[PDB]
Amino acid sequence: KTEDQRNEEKAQREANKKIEKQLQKDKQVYRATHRLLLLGAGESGKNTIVKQMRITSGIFETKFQVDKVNFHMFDVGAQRDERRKWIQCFNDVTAIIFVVASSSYQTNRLQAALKLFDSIWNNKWLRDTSVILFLNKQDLLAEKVLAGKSKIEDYFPEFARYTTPEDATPEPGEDPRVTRAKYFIRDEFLRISTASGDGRHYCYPHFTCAVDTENIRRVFNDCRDIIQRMHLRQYELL
Amino acid sequence: GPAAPLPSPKAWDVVLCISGTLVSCENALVVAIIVGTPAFRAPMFLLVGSLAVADLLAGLGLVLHFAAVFCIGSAEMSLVLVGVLAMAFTASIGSLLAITVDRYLSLYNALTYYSETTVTRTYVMLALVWGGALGLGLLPVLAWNCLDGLTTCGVVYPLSKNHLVVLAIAFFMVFGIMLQLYAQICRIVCRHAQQIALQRHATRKGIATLAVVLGAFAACWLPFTVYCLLGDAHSPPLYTYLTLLPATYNSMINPIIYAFRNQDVQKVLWAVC
Amino acid sequence: APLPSPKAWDVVLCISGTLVSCENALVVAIIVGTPAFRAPMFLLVGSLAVADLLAGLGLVLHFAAVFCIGSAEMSLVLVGVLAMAFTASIGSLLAITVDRYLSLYNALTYYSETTVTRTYVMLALVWGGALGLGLLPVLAWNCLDGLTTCGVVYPLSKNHLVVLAIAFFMVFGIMLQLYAQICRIVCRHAQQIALQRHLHYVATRKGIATLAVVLGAFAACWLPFTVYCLLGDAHSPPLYTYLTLLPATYNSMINPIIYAFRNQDVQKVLWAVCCC
Amino acid sequence: SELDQLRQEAEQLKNQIRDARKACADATLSQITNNIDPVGRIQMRTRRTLRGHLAKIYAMHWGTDSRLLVSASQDGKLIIWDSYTTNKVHAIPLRSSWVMTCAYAPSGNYVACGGLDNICSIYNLKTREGNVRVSRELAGHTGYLSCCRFLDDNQIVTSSGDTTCALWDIETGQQTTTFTGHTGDVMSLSLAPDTRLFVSGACDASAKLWDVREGMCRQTFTGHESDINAICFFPNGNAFATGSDDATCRLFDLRADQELMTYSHDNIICGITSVSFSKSGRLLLAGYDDFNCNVWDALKADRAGVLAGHDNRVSCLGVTDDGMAVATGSWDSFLKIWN
Amino acid sequence: NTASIAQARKLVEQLKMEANIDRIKVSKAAADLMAYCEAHAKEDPLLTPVPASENPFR
Amino acid sequence: QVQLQESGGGLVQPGGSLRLSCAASGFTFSNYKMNWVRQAPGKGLEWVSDISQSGASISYTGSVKGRFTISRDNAKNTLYLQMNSLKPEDTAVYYCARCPAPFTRDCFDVTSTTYAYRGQGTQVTVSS
């Protein structure tokens, strides 16, 4: 009662107040920092990208300092390929960085990336979270197309009818053939993305190479666009 | 009670009364959801709460002003009531401007939007809006009224022409600020719409909603201010409330656009119903 | 009918208009004479100077028509032209500020040269939104024939004045918002623009704060007149009218100094000319 | 040849066991339970809505005295609550932001946490210094840790995604026993009241009974159509209820070694996240991915009640040791107490 | 295909340990379950609601 | 017990048509989504074809496009894969797989090395 228990309750309220004052601070810390997933189908230069943006346990965490905005990037290792269970832990991430090797033509490892991307896009609890797509390892993409030893017609029968997009911005010094194939892989991912309505989910294709270092800037703009698109949908509008 | 009769209300007085009463009824539920649900305590929800309390206060002021002009008959009470009505309308305009600027800021620096800086900015915006509302609602009470009989006393007896002109000027400045803010938001939305349209191969929804909100604000508040600037003391009395009904209509419409359209508040409404 | 000599206030108004006309003539002379001076901002500055010079000539030969022989018709047309030039000048200043903001915001992320064409699309709008308005009711809604209401300027009616004041305060709010956005941009991206300056006056906090003073150099001048246009009536003293019109002519004088002569290249031209 | 022979032998033993299972099915549970009176409807009400978590609540557990509870959040905080007075007693910061399971030792002295970081961490609440400090960390598992329970203050059972279960002794810190019988991720495991046995349900649409002392699988229970997301013992320790993603909860009994009841509704497309029982074993509760909790009365497979106070997936649901209340923690960062 | 043979052998071993167990009839199991359910029905706060005097969560 | 049995397949001449049958039990065939995946010698699993719950959305991998037909008999609970104009590279060990959850558009973990809901697998060899 008030004779004996009153002091115990008062101490408990004081402890609650201290805990809440700590919770305010790490709440600011948590909500200020954004979070991203790093997902890799395999042999797509995920470690190369990690090393590029760098400047046993199953999860490795990396820190960013981009434009006074703190980012945390989480990769998944030492975990089995069955990912239908732990992928649900990542419905609060700002975006999922999907790294795909475009030199995939498992004999057809590109289709494995396409099928996996379908699962992420159509998943019930990954509907809100957007995906940043990095078509990676294009350094040899022009080489094999120029060499002509391997064809994407055999592994993708719908490339021959596909034409180069009119709204395309090829980089200088690029062959016309590789440019068309560069946007064919992108359109396959885009076909999955635009097939589903209910625009809570959007995809952000981005061509990438090992020599590139500015992948910070492309992620920063994507996180900028993703967050403001979510704000737009709240206020009707977009 | 020898003589001392209160004149019977005319055709438009009762419509003003009904509009104010139903505005209060409409805003009571919105402010109730704002206060009751602990989840609705984000920086942006405080802004809608401020707009809602200003609108509810305006409706309550309207119905009580009719009370004072119907079976109460107190001159000082009516002065106080028209003053607090003006304060409520100024607070509504300021809160709508603050809502727009907060939305634009959220759009602009989205990554840094969730910090202590946004809470401090929201507190400062609330303080400025309500302080300016009190200030512009204390001039027509303190010494700027028509009771002395020296000032012009423009359109809303009792309230001097100078205070009305100052209010119109402040409203026009706020209107320009909101026009530029919505131009910025239009640029953002148009860029995103072009990107999405290029991806798929549209803009109708965003253009429609921005046009609707800006047109509601303009077509509902402009006539009062323009007639305030143009009008004089001996102006026809029907124009006093003929262009004042759209103000009540805008105060009525504001929570529908800013509160009901929110998915979370809509879900809470469905849960209550 | 012998016209009495104008009072001293009309004389000093004419004198100030004469100095304004001379300064604007000098500025347009430097702009036109050098073919290299065709920068995207320089076209807007030249349009502002054109409106300013037109206002100066209008005021000077308005004093002429008042103190010399003349009828009310050409005086009415000319005062309408004067107000037309003034509202064109206000629009030009707003366009210059929005051009600065657009340049800064765009150059924050890449750049586009197509905006120069957009300048034309903007420019005509000003010279079609103000200019035409500055002559549309004056020739049609004049209060000289009138017998409806006049207001605080003898030729113009009160409805014209309140419409102009409404437009002015909308423009003032727009420019306040633009300056606020420019300040937010310069505060958030100070280091980037400091390092990326090489590829308008955008600089450190001390350097860009002068823009506020520039805004004051507008707000302190045109605000005292426009508000009076709402408050006054036909019986208001003309002394107040002249005393509040003088700040507008002072702002007309000072706009070339802060906008034309401020830039570095014309400053180099100035030292070259003075050295001779 | 040899592989085909082994496959044929496995098939023939499976057929023999199926025949044996069908032999003992004299009468179903429906016939025997038809006589008893139904409970009707239960109107459960929310009393305490615990707030203070930012990210989703993924696991929670009750104490032995039904007063203090623990909730873990993917924000990287482990909050120890007192549900009676809605104070918070201990906001433990987590080394890894991602956590998937928490557990209370049955003495009030230690707590356990685990997740994608592959390491289960024990925190001591009775430190002399007064500051909560991590006592031990165990890193034997390769796959992500799924759940963990305490046998006593010294032994802990952990189930991870490497298709293995482990029994650790805290003092020595190495794996005392291992359990390798599953063909998929072991999503959940539950402990018998006598603590001699425990049953783990995995993603192979199968549950397995294990004895801690001997370390071998006694019986395997099959019959589900999807991954068993959760499983809980009967209060008497002679039956267990398993909930999967096939929108059906099943009841199995050890001695008959076959299913008994098949709680399901035709309008339930949504799956099941967690299951639990009451003290008497009459009332059972099961969470759903459609942000409500359906309560099935006793055995007749009739929906006794619905608890629809949440907005997102209910992730954890637990009944106190004395059966006073049921605590449901969901993904809306809100943990509620119902009774 | 070497570890596959060992895995199949382990599966067969476990299966034939599992086969040789004693199973009582389902009716007896249901009888025990209902006996436990009815015996403890008076000690279940969730089954029969308790007055708010004895409820700590009131 | 959820088991899937695959019937058909063997040493066949190239260019022929082969029918592979997947018989299912222990679960509702109607609710779930069926997949066909093949295992090349010395390589991992690669997805081939899928058929949805009702039978409307049908998709194939690039290699088997235009030559493979996937159908389901809900009454017989039997999933048929029809192969036309086979090629030497088509030899593999086939597998009739089921995605883990019913009434779900996504279908995870069908090519993993250890999957519970996958059949023992029939053998198809194409050679002269």
Taking residue F88's Cβ as centre, other Cβ atoms within 10 Å add up to: 10
Q: Which of F1, F101, F114 sits opposite D245 (nearest CB)?
A: F101
Q: In 3D, which of B215, B79, B54, B207 has the Cα closest to residue B145?
A: B79
Decide: A and F in contact? Rule: 3+ Cβ pairs under 8 Å: yes
* CB spacing of D87 vs A124 below 8 angstroms: no
> Cβ of B209 and A236 within 8 Å?
yes
Residue B39's alpha-carbon distances to A19, A73, D283, D311, in angstroms, are 20, 28, 32, 11
- Count interface pairs B-D at CB distance under 8 A: 3
Q: Which residues of D touch B38 (CB under 8 A)?
A: 49, 51
C-alpha–C-alpha distance, residues B182 and A184, integer Å: 38
In 3D space, the residue among C157, C8, C172, C14 whose CA is nearest the CA of residue C97 turns out to be C172
Cβ–Cβ gap B230/C169 under 8 Å = no
- Could you give phi then psi for residue A16, rounded to 5 degrees? -60, -45
Query: What is the distance between the alpha carbons of residues C9 and C15, in angstroms, rounded to a whole number?
Result: 10
Residues belonging to chain A: 238
Residue by residue, DSSP assigns A187-211 as HHHHHHHHHS-STT--EEEEE--TT
Instruction: Check: CB of residue B248 under 8 Å from CB of residue B23.
Output: yes
What is the domain-level CATH number for residue E29? 4.10.260.10
For residues D50 and C24, what is the distance between their CA atoms, to the nearest angstrom?
72
The H or E element that residue D88 is part of is strand D87-93
Angstrom CA distances, C53 to B62, C60, D310, stand at 53, 11, 71
A70 touching B (Cβ < 8 Å): no
What single letter denotes the amino acid at residue B34?
I
CA dihedral (C174, C176, C177, C179) positive or negative: positive
C169: which 2 tokens? 């305060």
**Residue numbers in D near F27 (CB within 8 A):** 225, 246
Number of other residues whose CB lies within 10 A of the CB of residue A137: 21
Largest CA distance in chain C: 70
Helix, strand or coil, per DSSP, at residue F123: strand
CA distances for E55 relative to D324, D325, F98, F99, angstroms? 8, 10, 49, 46
Tell me the nearest-neighbour CA distance from A26 into chain F, angstroms. 35
A237 touches B205 (CB < 8 A): yes
The number of C-alpha atoms within 13 Å of D119 and in the hemisphere containing its C-beta is: 20
State the total domains in chain E.
1
Cα dihedral C98/C101/C105/C108 (nearest 10)? 140
> With 0-12 CB in 10 A as exposed, 13-18 as middle and 19+ as buried, what is B270?
exposed
Report domain extents, chain D.
1-339
Cα(F124)–Cα(D48) distance, rounded to whole angstroms? 62
In contact, D334 and D53? CB cutoff 8 Å: yes
Please check whether residue B148 is in contact with residue B72, taking contact to mean a CB–CB distance below 8 angstroms.
no
DSSP element (H, E) containing E12:
helix E3-19
Q: What is D196-244 written as a DSSP string?
A: SEEEEE-TTSEEEEEETTT-SEEEEEE--SS-EEEEEE-TTSSEEEEEE
CA distance B26 to B20: 10
Ramachandran class of D141: left when φ > 0, alpha when ψ lies in -120 to 50, beta otherwise:
beta
> To the nearest whole angstrom, how far is the Cα of A152 from the nearest Cα of chain B?
23
Task: Count Cα neighbours of F38 within 13 Å in the Cβ-side half-sphere.
Answer: 22
Q: Quick one: D64 exposed, middle or buried, by C-beta within 10 A (0-12, 13-18, 19+)?
A: middle
Neighbours of C237 (CB within 10 A): 10
What the block records as the tokens of A174 is 């690029």
Q: Which residue of B has its CA nearest to D309?
A: B271
Packing angle, helices C238-255 and C72-108, rounded to 10:
40
Give the dihedral sign, CA A228/A229/A230/A234: positive
**CB < 8 Å to F28, chain D:** 225
CATH superfamily name and code, D1-339: YVTN repeat-like/Quinoprotein amine dehydrogenase (2.130.10.10)
Q: Check residue B69 and report its DSSP letter.
A: H
F47 neighbourhood in chain A, CB within 8 Å: 111-112, 115
CA angle C15, C16, C18 (to 5 degrees): 65
Question: What radius of gyration, in Å, describes the C-alpha atoms of chain E?
Answer: 23
Contacts of residue A120, Cβ cutoff 8 Å, sequence gap at least 6:
A39, A87, A96, A98, A126, A131, F106
Q: Is the Cβ pair E30, D83 closer than 8 Å?
A: no
Burial of A21 (0-12, 13-18, 19+ CB in 10 A): exposed
The answer to whether the CB of F47 falls within 8 A of the CB of F35 is yes
Closest CA relative to residue A62, chosen from A42, A81, A77: A77
Decide: helix, strand or coil at residue C236: coil
Tokens of C201: 């006056």
Answer for the pair C266, C260: CB distance below 8 angstroms, yes or no. Answer: yes
Quickly list DSSP for F35-84: EEEEE-TTS-EEEEEEE-SSS--EEE-STTTTTEEEEEETTTTEEEEEE-
Residues of B in contact with D311 (CB under 8 A): 267
Please state, in angstroms and as integers, the Cα–Cα distance from residue E24 to each residue in D219, D223, D237, E19, following that order.
Answer: 14, 19, 16, 14
CA dihedral angle for residue A141, residue A146, residue A150, residue A156, rounded to 10 degrees: 70
Pick the closest to residue B122 from B42, B3, B61 (CA basis): B42
Set of chain F residues whose Cβ sits within 8 Å of the Cβ of A114 = none
The experimental technique used to determine this model is cryo-EM
Amino acid identity, position E47: L
Burial of F115 (0-12, 13-18, 19+ CB in 10 A): buried
Please state at what angle helix B75-108 crosses helix B245-255, rounded to 10 degrees: 40
Tokens of B75: 């001159």
Contact between residue C199 and residue B208 where contact means Cβ atoms under 8 Å apart: no
**Sequence-distant (≥ 6) Cβ neighbours of residue B73 within 8 angstroms:** B4, B6
Q: How far apart are CA C15 and CA B254, in angstroms?
A: 53
Query: Which of F49, F65, F43, F40 lies closest to F123 in space, CA to CA?
Result: F40
Smallest Cα–Cα separation from A207: which of A175, A176, A185, A177?
A: A185
Tokens of B158: 């009792």
- DSSP letters, B176-226, are HHHHHHHHHHHHHHHHHHHHHHHHH---HHHHHHHHHHHHHHHHHHHHHHH
Q: How far apart are CA A49 and CA A43, in angstroms?
A: 12
Residues in chain E, overall count = 58
C188 and B229: CB-CB below 8 Å? no
Tokens encoding F114: 């250890």
Task: For chain C, list the domains and their CATH numbers.
Answer: 8-275 (1.20.1070.10)
CA geometry: angle A229, A234, A235, nearest 5 deg: 100
What is the per-residue burial (b if ≥16 Cβ within 10 Å, else e) of A70-107? ebebbbbeebbebbbbbbbbbbebbbbbbbbbbbbbbe
Question: How far off is chain E from D277, nearest CA to CA, in Å?
Answer: 10
Q: Which two tokens stand for residue B132?
A: 């300016």
Both tokens assigned to A22: 């700590």
Nearest CA in chain A to B211: A237
Query: Which residues, at least 6 apart from B208, have a Cβ–Cβ distance to it below 8 Å?
Result: none
Return phi, psi of residue D50, to 5°.
-80, 130
Window 40-59 of B, Cβ < 8 Å to D:
none
For D80, list phi and psi in degrees, rounded to 5.
-105, 110
CB B104: neighbour CB atoms within 10 A? 18
Compute the distance between CA of residue A116 and CA of residue A109 in angstroms, rounded to an integer.
11
What's the rounded Cα separation, in Å, for the pair F36 and F42? Answer: 19
Distance separating alpha carbons of residues C268 and C244, to the nearest angstrom: 36
**Secondary structure of B6-53 as H, E, C letters:** CCCCCHHHHHHHHHHHHHHHHHHHHHHHHHHCCCCCCHHHHHHHHHHH
Region of B114 please: left (phi>0), alpha (psi -120 to 50) or beta: beta
DSSP state of F118: B
Which among A141, A130, A120 has a CA at the least distance from the CA of A183?
A141
To the nearest whole Å, the CA of F102 is away from the closest chain D CA by: 6
What is d(CA E43, CA E41) in angstroms, rounded to the nearest whole number?
A: 6
Q: Nearest Cβ partner of D226 from F1, F101, F120? A: F101
Give the torsion through C-alpha atoms of B37, B40, B46, B49, to 10 deg: -50
Q: Are strands D68-73 and F34-39 parallel, antiparallel or unpaired?
A: unpaired
Q: How far apart are CA D251 and CA B48, in angstroms?
A: 50
**Cα torsion angle, D92, D93, D96, D100, sign:** positive
Q: Which domains occur in chain F, in start order?
A: 3-126 (2.60.40.10)
Strands D77-82 and D87-93, by their bridges, are antiparallel
Number of Cβ atoms within 10 Å of the Cβ of D8: 10
CB contact under 8 A, D14 and F1: yes
**Token code pair at residue B155:** 């359109």
Helix (H, G, I), strand (E, B) or coil at A213: coil
Residues F38, F113, D181, D232, CA torsion sign: negative
C-beta neighbour count of C67 within 10 angstroms: 15
Q: How far, in Å, CA of C98 to CA of F7, rounded?
A: 75
Q: Which amino acid is located at F90 in the chain? A: D
Please give the Cα distance from D107 to F43 (Å, whole number): 52
Task: Give the resolution in Å.
Answer: 3.1
D335: three-class secondary structure by DSSP = strand
Cis peptide before B9 (omega within 30 of 0): no
* Contact indicator for A210, A99 with CB cutoff of 8 Å: no
Domain containing residue E16: 4-54
Chain pair A-D, CB pairs under 8 angstroms = 90
Beta D145-150 vs D155-160: how paired, if at all? antiparallel
Residue of B nearest to C165 (CA): B169
Contacts of A188 by beta carbon, 8 Å cutoff, 6+ apart: A114, A156
Whether the Cβ atoms of residue B63 and residue B20 lie closer than 8 Å to each other: yes
Taking the CA atoms of chain D, what radius of gyration do you get in angstroms?
Answer: 20
F122-126 and F11-12 beta bridge pairing: parallel
Which residues, other chains included, contact D220 with Cβ-Cβ below 8 Å and sequence gap of 6+? D181, D206, D207, D208, D209, E18
The size of chain F, in residues, is 128
**Residue A67 backbone zone (phi > 0: left; psi -120 to 50: alpha; other: beta):** left
* B183 CA: distance to closest CA in chain C (Å): 10
CA-closest candidate to residue C181, choices A234, B210, B185, B214: B185
Residue F75, CA atoms < 13 Å, CB-side half-sphere? 0
Measured CA to CA, the distance from residue A187 to residue A185 in angstroms comes to 6
CA–CA separation, F24 and E9 (whole Å):
25
Q: Distance between CA atoms of E38 and D236, rounded to whole angstroms?
A: 12
Instruction: Kindly write down the DSSP assignment for every residue of C55-118, as one continuous string.
Output: HHHHHHHHHHHHHSS--HHHHHHHHHHHHHHHHHHHHHHHHHHHHHHHHHHHHHS---STHHHH
Q: How far is A227 from chain D (nearest CA, A)?
A: 17
C-alpha span between F25 and B107 (Å, rounded):
54
CATH numbers and ranges of domains, chain A:
34-234 (3.40.50.300)
Q: Give the whole-angstrom CA distance, residue A100 versus residue A132.
A: 11
Contact between chains at D91 and A22 (C-beta distance less than 8 A): yes
Half-sphere exposure of D152 (CA within 13 A, CB side): 7
| Phi and psi torsions of D177, nearest 5° | -145, 155
> b/e for B28-37, b at 16 or more Cβ within 10 A?
ebbbebbeee
Which residue from F44, F115, B69 is spatially nearest to D182, judged by alpha carbons?
Answer: F115
A11 phi and psi angles, rounded to 5 deg = -65, -40
Query: What one-character-per-residue DSSP string does D166-183 give?
Result: EEEETTT-SEEEEE---S
The number of residues making up chain C comes to: 276
B70: DSSP letter:
T
In chain D, what residues touch E41 (CB-CB under 8 Å)?
280, 282
Question: What are the CA-CA distances from residue B263 to residues B95, B267, D127, E22 (Å)?
Answer: 21, 6, 47, 58
Residue A99's nearest CA partner among A123, A72, A76, A80 is A76
Of E12, E37, E45, which is closest to D323 when you measure between CB atoms?
Answer: E45
Which of F:44-103 have CB within 8 Å of A? 44-47, 61-63, 65-66, 100
> Are A139 and A210 a contacting pair, CB within 8 Å?
yes
Which contacts qualify for B213-218: CB closer than 8 Å, 24 or more apart? Answer: B213/B257, B214/B178, B214/B179, B214/B182, B216/B250, B216/B253, B216/B257, B217/B96, B217/B175, B217/B178, B217/B250, B218/B175
